[PDB]
Amino acid sequence: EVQLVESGGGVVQPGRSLRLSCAASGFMFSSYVMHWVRQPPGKGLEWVAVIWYDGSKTYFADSMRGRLTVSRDNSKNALYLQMNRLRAEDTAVYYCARQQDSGYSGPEVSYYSHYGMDVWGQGTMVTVSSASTLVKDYFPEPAVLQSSGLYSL
Amino acid sequence: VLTQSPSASGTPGQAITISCSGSSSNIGSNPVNWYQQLPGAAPKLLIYADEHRPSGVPDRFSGSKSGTSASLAISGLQSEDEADYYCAAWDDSLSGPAVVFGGGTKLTVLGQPKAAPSVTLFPPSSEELQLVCLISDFYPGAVTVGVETTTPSKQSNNKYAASSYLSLTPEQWKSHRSYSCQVTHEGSTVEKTVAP
Amino acid sequence: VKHFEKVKILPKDRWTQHTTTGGSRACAVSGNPSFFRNMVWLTEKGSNYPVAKGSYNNTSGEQMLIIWGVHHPNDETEQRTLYQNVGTYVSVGTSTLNKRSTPEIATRPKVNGQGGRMEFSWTLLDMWDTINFESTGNLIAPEYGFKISKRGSSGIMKTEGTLE
Amino acid sequence: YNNTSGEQMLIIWGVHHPNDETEQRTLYQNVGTYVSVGTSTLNKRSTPEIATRPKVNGQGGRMEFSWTLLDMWDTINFESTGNLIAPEYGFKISKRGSSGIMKTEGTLE
Ligand SMILES: *[C@@H]1O[C@H](CO)[C@@H](O[C@@H]2O[C@H](CO)[C@@H](O[C@@H]3O[C@H](CO[C@H]4O[C@H](CO)[C@@H](O)[C@H](O)[C@@H]4O)[C@@H](O)[C@H](O)[C@@H]3O)[C@H](O)[C@H]2NC(C)=O)[C@H](O)[C@H]1NC(C)=O
Ligand SMILES: *[C@@H]1O[C@H](CO)[C@@H](O[C@@H]2O[C@H](CO)[C@@H](O[C@@H]3O[C@H](CO[C@H]4O[C@H](CO)[C@@H](O)[C@H](O)[C@@H]4O)[C@@H](O)[C@H](O)[C@@H]3O)[C@H](O)[C@H]2NC(C)=O)[C@H](O)[C@H]1NC(C)=O
């Protein structure tokens, strides 16, 4: 019953911003440095950010510069992501994962670097389009979606 | 970014090996973990800090690293072992410290015969006010064909499918290089070429 | 023993070359990783773990009880991540004493979610004598020592009862 | 071993102490070996002390055995690179009670 559950996913229009949470349960949250990582839909994995157990330090992906706030409420067992100025690239499934340690917690990355990510959530899917509302260019939802923010197959 | 073999396949009882490679920055300095994602679902950590497995993980799985390269091995093979496999390592680059993921790998246990696809073309319809290459079935997946392509799909016959579409700014250049859709089974890249 | 004066002998801040701010979730204070208030858990700083040295001459005016630990990691991995170099050791000595202990490593059942262990030892440091620690890792250091203030017939009473 | 027996279990293990480095090599191959045992409460990493000793039972080597009481539901771990004498067995305590060990040269009638 150790688990993380991501929420807030949905549709978001490009140029706007997205807000996401993760709910931790069945373990001690405040002792664990936590992770944001996303998988675009059918492509591979992309690391997003990392936040320290005590919230003392954050590290962002080079992709995320200037668009990203990451925070945590330890007492609420809550992970918080807020990302600005979105685009098609940012469309993806979003994952909250827990960084594993020995018993030990400390400020240096040198400790955690040897380990990594023993538990994940089932994710929350995010789709970026300004749109809304054979078969081609249709809404809403084998299909695939083009740059027009539209679906077809 | 890190890099891995494009795809893999093997037989029940067989042992197979997948590779990961990258800069002195990441792997050269910091060690490597391996994650396994079974279809329709979410990742679970297969291996941590090179050699070491976590609890709940069968012995057949195990791995290693040397220099800037790392490797993963399955000593015996069950149907349960069909999934996508990712190497991951911390970087300690500049701009700043960061985790890094390999592109990926998909492997297939071959619970059935191999095959080769049906691919058909059907150029743009004459309705035509200002494309579709579909591979009608095949096994295993990962056929690696305004560029658009879908992700190989399961179906009744228990071989897979797919689709690819393009565009137009509606002319004719390609031709005469025309229209092709050559798709590759690792085993033949194959050509449907049609149309003006 | 009837009273203790708690002396700061080897202050946390005096190790500039190691990480003293580390803790564990077994000592966790309200969900946040912590550690023994009277001990310092040394780890690598900047990926290096230089030789750690400390000494105390006893000016307290009385005998002093001193305690130190040695960490026993669950696996060679943990050893590397924490203390860097392996083949470590911990050395304590005084007018009368000698110990160079090495960190016995074994995979053990999780206890407090912890496979590692800490073996503590103590000694009585005579007035005017001097205590020496040096270690290449796995050293849990005293930040403090207990000077004996009052002495006298006394005891330890085992009871479930409370003070009225 | 996780203890499913239903009661406490006595466990014993040895460590071999060869007569010479030769013996060490021929038997266990690699030198600089060790033997590791651990439980909820216990820790030992012992190393094989080597000394040339008088033949005893035509044997210059020795075996140092140790034991422990493994609590119900607890787990015992051995790992070694050599000189390990392993238990194939453990003794679960069945019946408990005032008893003793009597030293006598006599026999049961
Ligand atoms: C740890 O620190 C201690 C105090 O700072 C050191 O103890 C002192 O050490 C010095 C030199 O080692 C000794 O100085 C000598 O004193 C004697 C006689 O002194 C008389 O009075 C003192 C009290 O002041 C008394 O303790 C003695 O029994 C004597 O009655 C002279 O003859 C020498 O020339 C020299 O000046 C101190 O005697 C000594 N104090 C004590 C309490 O004994 C100690 O050396 C330090 N340890 C280390 C390793 O450096
Ligand atoms: C070694 O094997 C042992 C048995 O296979 C393991 O002992 C069991 O461990 C599991 C999980 O670690 C515990 O499951 C929990 O049970 C509690 C409450 O269960 C109640 O009933 C059990 C008897 O069935 C009793 O022992 C407890 O005191 C409780 O009254 C739940 O709240 C949890 O959600 C969870 O289901 C078992 O409780 C535990 N058995 C015993 C005898 O305590 C042991 O974990 C194994 N050791 C290792 C290292 O894996």
Same-domain pairing of B106 and B116:
no
Residue where a domain stops, chosen among B81, B111, B141: B111
Q: How many residues does chain C have?
A: 164
What distance in Å separates the CA atoms of residue B44 and residue B39, rounded to the nearest whole number?
12
Q: How far is CA C124 from CA C94, C135, C144, in A?
A: 10, 20, 13
* Contact (Cβ atoms closer than 8 angstroms) between residue B34 and residue B72: yes
Same-domain pairing of B82 and B8:
yes
> Coil, strand or helix: which one is A63?
helix
CA of A24 vs chain C CAs: smallest distance (Å): 13
Upstream peptide bond of B95 is cis (omega within 30 degrees of 0): yes
Q: How many residues does chain B have?
A: 196
What distance in Å separates the CA atoms of residue B36 and residue B18, rounded to the nearest whole number?
12
What distance in Å separates the CA atoms of residue A109 and residue B96, rounded to the nearest whole number?
11
Sign, Cα dihedral of B56, B58, B64, B68: negative
Same-domain pairing of B149 and B98:
no
Same-domain pairing of B92 and B118:
no
Query: Is B31's Cβ below 8 Å from some Cβ in A?
Result: yes
Cβ-based neighbour number of residue D75 at 10 Å: 16
The amino acid at B173: W
Helical H runs in chain A?
109-112
Same-domain pairing of B97 and B169:
no
Same-domain pairing of B84 and B144:
no
Percentage helix, strand, coil, to 5, in chain B?
5, 35, 60
What is the whole-number distance in angstroms between the Cα of residue A7 and the centre of ligand 2?
32
> Coil, strand or helix: which one is B169?
coil
> Coil, strand or helix: which one is D6?
coil
B7-9 and B106-108 as β-strands: parallel, antiparallel, unpaired? parallel
Percentage helix, strand, coil, to 5, in chain D?
5, 35, 60
Same-domain pairing of B77 and B125:
no
Give me the domain span that covers residue B84. 1-111
Element (H, E) at B17: strand B16-21
Same-domain pairing of B80 and B44:
yes
Q: Report domain extents, chain A.
A: 1-130
What distance in Å separates the CA atoms of residue A18 and residue A83, rounded to the nearest whole number?
5
In chain A, breaks (C-N over 2.5 A) are found after: 133, 141
- Residue B162: both structure tokens together: 């797919």
CATH number at residue B27: 2.60.40.10
Same-domain pairing of B30 and B88:
yes
**How many whole angstroms from its chain centre is CA C22?**
14
Same-domain pairing of B30 and B104:
yes
What distance in Å separates the CA atoms of residue B3 and residue B21, rounded to the nearest whole number?
5
Cβ-based neighbour number of residue C51 at 10 Å: 10
End-to-end Cα separation, chain C, in angstroms: 23
Here the contacts of A87-90 (C-beta below 8 Å, separation 24 or greater) are: A87/A14, A87/A128, A88/A14, A88/A128, A88/A147, A88/A149, A89/A40, A90/A18, A90/A126, A90/A128
Sign, Cα dihedral of C146, C151, C154, C155: positive
Q: Which of 3.30.1330.10, 3.90.1140.10, 3.90.209.20, 3.30.565.10 would CATH assign to domain C1-161?
A: 3.90.209.20
What distance in Å separates the CA atoms of residue A151 and residue A100, rounded to the nearest whole number?
39
CA of D77 vs chain C CAs: smallest distance (Å): 6
Query: Is B99's Cβ below 8 Å from some Cβ in A?
Result: yes
Angle at A140 between CA A120 and CA A85, to 5 degrees: 60
What distance in Å separates the CA atoms of residue D71 and residue B177, rounded to the nearest whole number?
78
- Looking at chain B, which residue has its C-alpha nearest residue C75? B52
**Chain A from 93 to 112: CB within 8 A of any C CB:** 102-108, 110-111
What distance in Å separates the CA atoms of residue B67 and residue A49, rounded to the nearest whole number?
27
Q: Which of 3.60.10.10, 2.60.120.10, 2.40.30.10, 2.60.40.10 would CATH assign to domain A1-130?
A: 2.60.40.10
Q: What are phi and psi of B79, to 5 degrees?
A: -55, -30
Same-domain pairing of B9 and B103:
yes
Q: Is C130 in the pocket of ligand 1 (CB under 6 A)?
A: yes
C21/A106 CB distance under 8 A = yes
The method recorded for this entry reads X-ray
What distance in Å separates the CA atoms of residue B159 and residue B113, rounded to the nearest whole number?
10
- Ligand nearest to the CA of residue D39, numbered in listed order: 2
The beta strands (E) that lie in chain C are given as: 4-8, 18-19, 23-29, 32-34, 39-41, 43-44, 52-57, 64-72, 90-94, 97-101, 117-125, 130-135, 139-142, 144-148
Residues of A in contact with B150 (CB under 8 A): 42, 142-144, 153
Same-domain pairing of B88 and B128:
no
Query: Is A152's Cβ below 8 Å from some Cβ in B?
Result: yes
Q: How far is CA A111 from CA A103, B32, B90, in A?
A: 11, 14, 11
- Residue C58: both structure tokens together: 């006893």
What distance in Å separates the CA atoms of residue B77 and residue D69, rounded to the nearest whole number?
40
DSSP-assigned states of every residue in D40-66: TTEEEEE---------SSS---EEEEE
What is the whole-number distance in angstroms between the Cα of residue C63 and the centre of ligand 1?
17
- Residue B4: both structure tokens together: 């891995």
Domain count, chain B: 2
What distance in Å separates the CA atoms of residue C83 and residue C41, rounded to the nearest whole number?
11
Tell me chain C's radius of gyration from C-alpha atoms: 17
